[PDB]
Design a binder for this molecule. Structure first.
Ligand SMILES: O=C(O)Cc1cccc(-c2ccc(Cl)cc2Oc2ccccc2)c1
Length: 134
């Protein structure tokens, strides 16, 4: 159905801003922030039918989620939070909401020019992570 076509592919992190602050807001501890903040993950997005898969490979952690839009799932984040996640498409933006311990964070993923821009928001803190095709 060509849902998410423009996201599919292999992407490499090329810039980050305010990610340490976003991680602090989320509750990540010092040593994990330092190691995760160094990483330059490879994000691999694919679609098979209604199922979207987002994999991240890095020297820190490798992660993988598979999901159907609008349908809540279990996720273990790279910092080992056990969260309940729902991912939707809103106006061509992938919106990923994570709920845990009465907290919430939202991760938005959008295509902008030849980049895939990832915006991570926790309370008033935003981190912007820019990916290019690998
Ligand atoms: O995907 C994005 O770029 C933004 C992004 C989105 C959602 C979660 C995290 C994230 C939150 C905490 C920690 Cl410790 C690592 C994290 O990701 C990683 C995973 C591997 C390597 C580095 C950061 C990063």
């Amino acid at each position: 159905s060509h849902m998410c076509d423009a996201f599919v592919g292999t992407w490499k992190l090329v810039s980050s801003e305010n990610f340490d602050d976003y991680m602090k807001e989320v509750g990540v501890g010092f040593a994990t922030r330092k190691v995760a903040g160094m990483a330059k993950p490879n994000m691999i997005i694919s679609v098979n039918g209604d199922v979207i898969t987002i994999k991240s490979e890095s020297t820190f952690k490798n992660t993988e989620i598979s999901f159907i839009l609008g349908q809540e799932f279990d996720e273990v984040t790279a910092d080992d939070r056990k969260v309940k996640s729902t991912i939707t498409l809103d106006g061509g933006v992938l919106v990923h909401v994570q709920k845990w311990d009465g907290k919430s964070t939202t991760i938005k993923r959008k295509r902008e020019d030849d980049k895939l821009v990832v915006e991570c928001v926790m309370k008033g803190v935003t981190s912007t992570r820019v990916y290019e095709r690998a």
